[PDB]
């Protein structure tokens, strides 16, 4: 309000990511998540300072994209319509992903009323993607098959 | 936006249900929850395709109602103002229930701007009810009394 | 809608608090949380009955403030920009805190359309504060250092 809603959602997302992090059992995913938590403070500042302070960089976005590609290689084909769940590790990541998608919606809504750097929405979008991959990888490493609709 | 918000909330709800499912210890509740997760994909399609694709059926609604009646028989009298919590199993179901109630609110809001089949809101309403019953049953089976306000 | 959104958020918050309560390992925090869950029913009635029924008292607000001061003494200096997480106990409290902050936003929005007692927003604000302190105390007692951005 106008960006207070976005800021609040970033905060909520960060808390959900912290929860997923505590449950994660792998260093690569844990490192991704901790990096993201720090990136979210930058995203918040970018949005709040109208881009006058620290800003979301293309490098930050590229890291998420690179990790997504790497994990897609580990998973292989991804059948559409994955039922979210399986393990608590994956479940927590799917909940975090849902909040990240809500963040995307809030950014889009706020952008129509206030100026927001394009990298903010782009980062949020890539974050939703990496969290989905984290969820799939977690189940795979725990020997839990995905259920499809 | 107009239904993007509803779709996003369905997604969030599905993730919370998946979490509650992983924590559940009984086949009847687990089966209800998995059925619901699949029903939510149908609900999403109904809303997105304006009812042109798959739609929420009265049969789907009736199943939830039948299960609610069955569980009400197991619980007996339900004193109003149950403090949500007790066990992690029940706590997760109460969180899922809160999101389902949010889904109801989002459907009502969207229905004033776009056409949405009546079965969509009805299903969402019954879902909020069954999740409440799941929470009560879970505590009962775990020997945890409910706390009342 | 106008206060239906506030009521729904209070419900969601109560469910998140119940989750954090189940995970808590200390009587002081557990007692605070249970008191809050009961206070939330009062907050809901205050909002719904337009202040005609039970209302949020200054005493209820004072209790939260007193507990916050007490816990600040246990923590000592609080470096700004705490990354939410560390333990599942703290993570759940940070998630609850995010929902409480959302409640604050919803109350502010609703107050511009309907009359709401000032104690309602004040209580919500203090609740967000105490949950943050609960999260810090939980990690401290579990020998988990906070991570700072």
Q: Which domains does chain C have, with CATH numbers?
A: 1-149 (1.20.1200.10)
To the nearest 5 percent, what fractions of chain B are helix, strand and coil?
A: 70, 5, 25
At a CB cut-off of 8 Å and minimum separation 6, what does C116 contact? C3, C6, C46, C47, C50, C51, C107, C110
C-alpha radius of gyration, chain A, whole number: 15
Q: Which residues in chain C have their CB less than 8 angstroms from residue B98's CB? A: 8, 11-12, 14-15
Q: How far apart are CA C24 and CA B144, in angstroms?
A: 17
Interface subset of B 38-97, CB within 8 angstroms of A? 38, 41
Q: B55: left (phi > 0), else alpha (psi -120 to 50), else beta?
A: beta
| Angle subtended at Cα A63 by Cα A86 and Cα A2, rounded to the nearest 5 degrees | 85
Residues in chain B: 149
Q: Which of B19, B23, B91, B125 to mutate to test the interface with C (most CBs of C within 10 A)?
A: B91
Q: How far apart are CA B13 and CA B29, in angstroms?
A: 16
Element (H, E) at B7: helix B4-23
Q: How far apart are CA C79 and CA A95, in angstroms?
A: 29
How many Cα neighbours within 13 Å face the side chain of A49? Answer: 12
Q: What is the DSSP letter of A149?
A: -
Q: How far apart are CA B116 and CA B124, in angstroms?
A: 13
Q: Considering only CA atoms, which of A70, A48, A62 is closest in space to residue A4?
A: A48
Secondary structure (H, E, C), C16-36: HHHHHHHHCCCHHHHHHHHHH
Q: Considering only CA atoms, which of C96, C108, C126 is closest in space to residue C3?
A: C108
Q: How far apart are CA C76 and CA C71, in angstroms?
A: 8
For residue B131, give the 3-state DSSP assignment. helix
Angle between helices A4-23 and A27-48 (to 10 degrees): 170
Provide φ and ψ at A87, rounded to 5°. -135, 160
Q: How far apart are CA A136 and CA A139, in angstroms?
A: 5
Instruction: Report whether C94 contacts C16 (CB < 8 A).
Output: no
> Is A15 touching B (CB cutoff 8 A)?
no
Q: How far apart are CA A84 and CA A23, in angstroms?
A: 16
Residues in chain A: 149
What are the CA-CA distances from residue A30 to residues A37, A129, A136, C85, C86 (Å)? 11, 16, 14, 12, 12
Q: E strands along C7-148, which residues?
A: 82-83, 147-148
Q: How far apart are CA A42 and CA B146, in angstroms?
A: 43
Name the minimum distance, in Å, from the CA of A11 to any CA of chain C. Answer: 6
Angle between helices C4-23 and C88-111 (to 10 degrees): 170
Nearest to A105 among B8, B16, B21 (CB): B8
Q: How far apart are CA B99 and CA B12, in angstroms?
A: 8
Q: Give this entry's resolution in angstroms.
A: 1.5
Instruction: Report whether B82 contacts B147 (CB < 8 A).
Output: yes
Size of interface A-B (CB pairs under 8 A): 60
Q: How far apart are CA C33 and CA C133, in angstroms?
A: 12
**Hunting for tokens 């509650």 — which residue is that?**
B20
Q: How far apart are CA C66 and CA A142, in angstroms?
A: 45
What are the CA-CA distances from residue B98 to residues A89, B144, C7, C15 (Å)? 22, 21, 11, 7
Residues C87, A22: C-beta atoms closer than 8 Å: yes
Strand partners, C148: C82
For residue C102, give the 3-state DSSP assignment. helix
For residue C83, give the 3-state DSSP assignment. strand
What is the DSSP track for B16-55? HHHHHHHH---HHHHHHHHHHHHHHHHHHHHHHTTTSSS-
Residues C87, A4: C-beta atoms closer than 8 Å: no
Determine the distance from the C-alpha atom of residue A42 to the mean position of all C-alpha atoms in its chain, rounded to a whole number: 14
Q: Considering only CA atoms, which of C125, C144, C129, C59 is closest in space to residue C94?
A: C129
Provide φ and ψ at A108, rounded to 5°. -60, -45
Angle between helices B4-23 and B88-111 (to 10 degrees): 170
What are the CA-CA distances from residue B4 to residues B45, B49, B84, B114, B120 (Å)? 12, 12, 29, 11, 15
Determine the distance from the C-alpha atom of residue B81 to the mean position of all C-alpha atoms in its chain, rounded to a whole number: 19
Q: Considering only CA atoms, which of A13, A47, A8 is closest in space to residue A130?
A: A13
CA-based torsion, A36, B7, B95, B55: positive or negative: negative
Q: Which residues in chain A have their CB less than 8 angstroms from residue C91's CB? A: 15, 18-19, 21-22
How many Cα neighbours within 13 Å face the side chain of A65? Answer: 9
| Angle subtended at Cα B136 by Cα B144 and Cα A84, rounded to the nearest 5 degrees | 110
Instruction: Report whether A127 contacts A14 (CB < 8 A).
Output: no
What is the DSSP track for A55-87? ---HHHHHHHHHHHHHHHHHH----S-EES-SS
Q: Within 10 A of B140 (CB to CB), how many other CB atoms are there?
A: 17
Strand partners, B147: B83
């Amino acid at each position: 309000s106008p960006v207070v809603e976005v800021q609040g959602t970033i905060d909520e997302l960060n808390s959900f990511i912290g929860y997923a992090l505590v449950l994660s059992r792998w260093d690569d995913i844990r490192n991704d998540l901790f990096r993201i938590q720090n990136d979210l403070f930058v995203l918040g500042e970018d949005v709040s300072t109208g881009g006058k302070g620290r800003t979301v960089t293309r490098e930050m976005i590229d890291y998420l994209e690179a990790r997504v590609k790497e994990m897609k290689a580990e998973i292989g084909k991804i059948e559409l319509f994955v039922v979210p769940g399986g393990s608590v590790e994956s479940a927590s990541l799917h909940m975090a992903r849902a909040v990240s998608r809500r963040l995307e919606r809030r950014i889009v809504a706020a952008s129509k009323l206030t100026e927001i750097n394009k990298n903010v929405l782009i980062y949020a979008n890539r974050l939703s993607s990496i969290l989905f991959m984290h969820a799939l990888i977690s189940n795979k490493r725990l020997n839990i098959p995905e259920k499809i609709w």
